[PDB]
């Protein structure tokens, strides 16, 4: 399964 | 001279010259944590000056214990120690120990308040659980997990800071002083997940009395088999409270609050109903939480004594050079 690679901390 | 000094608050950090542009990012018991640039790694790091490690046996044995565990409990979801050093060059002199760790981008405080898909929600929770599992494997029960203790990166990686104010994430058996086990930390995970979904601290309040009320108000009174298990004094307060049934999980966490989506919603809620359990004997374990359908999608096996002060300085110094 493809895990997320982005998280908008900005 | 390999070292230089930088004044940070009422503290001086005397650091290797490779660590540059020190700036404070943390202030809490243990002390000031500074962010810094590491010129040798071409990377940002966090530098923590242990607090008064040779003030007494108690401080010394805890410093030594902190060092050994950080140096050998490594994992992708626990903040890694990159270096440790002292500016003093003899035992006579030896006073300060500096820990250099990874620096990530932020706390969970930020992320909790933003609305996240189930993929991110559950991938974060998966990493949390994995990091907690490795801690426990190493014999470390945290007891004070919370959003400010858990740090994240821009690619959705997550690490746990260390191992023991906001008391809102502490488990009822601590609150009540009944002794505790590994799944003490599952409650905290429940609180953080609940707050991720609701965007509000689940159990606020001034103090532990207020705390308990919010817990029973929402979750309902625990049963007598929980109360019997209480020390008589705490058992007499806790049995005089209103006998609440609880608001129930479908209403504490309705579909509305979530973003398959109904049976991802209901999986999240089922996981929450198994972690947000007052009685530790009836509360889910880390292994079981990792095995839950909501979390299990990411599953990857690859991831899941008396001494003088002097004598303690010898032992710690050995560790600094390691
Ligand atoms: C105060 O001490 C720390 O916040 C530490 S100690 C090792 C990492 C971090 N913080 C981070 O990685 C990311 C951050 C959290 C808060 C500010 S930046």
Q: What is the 3-state secondary structure (H, E, C) of chain B?
A: CCEEEEEECCEEEEEECCEEEEEEEEEECCEEEEEEEECCCCEEEEEEECCCCCCCHHHHHHHHHHHHHHHHCCCCCECCEEEEECCCCCCCCCCCCEEEEECCCEEHHHHHHCCCCHHHHHHHHHHHHHHHHHHHHCCCCCCCCCHHHEEECCCCCEEECCCCCCCCCCCHHHHCCCCCCCCHHHHHHHHHHHHHHHCCCCCCCCCHHHHHHHHHHHHCCCCHHHHHCCCHHHHHHHHHCCCCCCCCHHHHCCHHHCCCHHHHHHHHHHHHHHHCCCCHHHCCCHHHHHCCHHHHCCCCCCCCCCCCHHHHHHHHHHHHHC
Q: Report residue B300 CA to chain centroid gap.
A: 22
Are B12 and B136 in a shared domain? no
Residue B248: CATH number of its domain: 1.10.510.10
Known catalytic residues of B?
A: 144
B320 within 8 A of B147, measured Cβ to Cβ: no
- B298 is a domain residue: yes
Is the CB of residue B116 less than 8 Å from the CB of residue B172?
no
Output the CA–CA distances (angstroms, integers) from residue B69 to B78, B129, B137, B142, B213, in the order listed. Answer: 11, 19, 11, 13, 37
- Ligand 1: centre distance to CA B119 (Å): 24
In ligand 1, which atom is closest to the CA atom of B152?
13
Examine the fold and report which residue of B51, B85, B105 is the final residue of a domain before the chain moves on.
B105
Q: How far apart are CA B283 and CA B272, in angstroms?
A: 10
Task: Return d(Cα B111, Cα B161) in angstroms, integer.
Answer: 16
Say if residue B188 is in the same domain as residue B252. Answer: yes
DSSP letter at A1 equals -
Atom of ligand 1 nearest to the CA of B103: 12
Say how far apart CA B30 and CA B44 lie, in whole Å: 21
Please name every residue paired with B78 in a beta bridge, in sequence order, or none if there are none: B160
Q: How far apart are CA B100 and CA B135, in angstroms?
A: 19
Please name the residues in contact with B239: beta carbons below 8 A apart, sequence gap of 6 or more: B227
Closest CB to A4: pick one of B106, B114, B120. B120
CATH code, B83: 3.30.200.20
Degrees, nearest 5: CA angle B200-B204-B208 = 160
- Residues B257/B259/B264/B265 CA torsion (nearest 10 deg): 10
Residues B251 and B152 both lie in one domain:
yes
- Tokens for B150, please give them: 């858990």
User: What is the distance between the alpha carbons of residues B178 and B24, in angstroms, rounded to a whole number?
Assistant: 37
Distance of CA B206 to the CA centre of its chain: 21
- How many domains would you assign to chain B? 2
Q: Verify that B126 and B261 share a domain, yes or no.
A: yes
Residues B137, B222: one domain? yes
Resolution to one decimal, Å? 2.2
What is the CA(B211)–ligand 1 centre distance, in A? Answer: 27
| B188 and B239 within one domain | yes
Q: Obtained via which technique?
A: X-ray
What is the distance in A from the centroid of ligand 1 to the CA of A5? 20
Instruction: Determine the Cα–Cα distance for residues B127 and B12; give it in Å rounded to an integer.
Output: 35
Chain B nearest C-alpha distance from A10 (Å):
8
Q: How far is CA B232 from CA B67, B173, B239, B264, B292, in A?
A: 39, 14, 10, 42, 36
Of the three residues B105, B130, B154, the one that is the final residue of a domain is: B105
Around ligand 1, the residues with Cβ closer than 6 Å are B 25-26, 33, 46, 79, 101, 103-104, 106-107, 151, 161
Asked if B297's CB is within 8 angstroms of A1's CB, the reply is yes
B29 is in an annotated binding site: yes
Domain that holds residue B79: 3-105
Contact, B148 vs B166, CB < 8 A? yes
């Amino acid at each position: 399964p493809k895990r997320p690679t982005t998280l908008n901390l900005f | 001279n390999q070292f230089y000094s930088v004044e940070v608050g009422d503290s001086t950090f005397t650091v290797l010259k490779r660590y540059q542009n020190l700036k404070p990012i943390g202030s809490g018991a243990q002390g000031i944590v500074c962010a810094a640039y590491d010129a040798v790694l071409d990377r940002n790091v966090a530098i923590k000056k242990l607090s008064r490690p040779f003030q007494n046996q108690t401080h010394a044995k805890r410093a030594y214990r902190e060092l050994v565990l950080m140096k050998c409990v490594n994992h992708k979801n626990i903040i890694s120690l990159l270096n440790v050093f002292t500016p003093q060059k003899t035992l006579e002199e030896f006073q300060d120990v500096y820990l250099v760790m990874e620096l990530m981008d932020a706390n969970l405080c930020q992320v909790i308040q933003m609305e996240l898909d189930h993929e991110r929600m559950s991938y974060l929770l998966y990493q949390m659980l994995c990091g907690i599992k490795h801690l426990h494997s190493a014999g470390i029960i945290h007891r004070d997990l919370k959003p400010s203790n858990i740090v994240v990166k821009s690619d959705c990686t997550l690490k746990i800071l260390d191992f023991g104010v906001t008391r809102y994430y502490r488990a009822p058996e601590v609150i009540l002083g009944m002794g505790y086990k590994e799944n003490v930390d599952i409650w905290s995970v429940g609180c953080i997940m609940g707050e991720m979904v609701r965007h509000k601290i689940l159990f606020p309040g001034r103090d532990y009395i207020d705390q308990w009320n919010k817990v029973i108000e929402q979750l309902g009174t625990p049963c007598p088999e929980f109360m019997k298990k209480l020390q008589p004094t705490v058992r007499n307060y806790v049995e005089n409270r209103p006998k609440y049934a609880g608001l129930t999980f479908p209403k504490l966490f309705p579909d509305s609050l979530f973003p398959h989506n109904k049976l991802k919603a209901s999986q999240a809620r089922d996981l929450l109903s198994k972690m947000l359990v007052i009685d530790p004997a009836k509360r889910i374990s880390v292994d079981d939480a990792l095995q839950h359908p909501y979390i299990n999608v990411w599953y990857d096996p690859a991831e899941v004594r008396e001494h003088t002060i002097e004598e303690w300085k010898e032992l710690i110094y050995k560790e600094v050079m390691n």
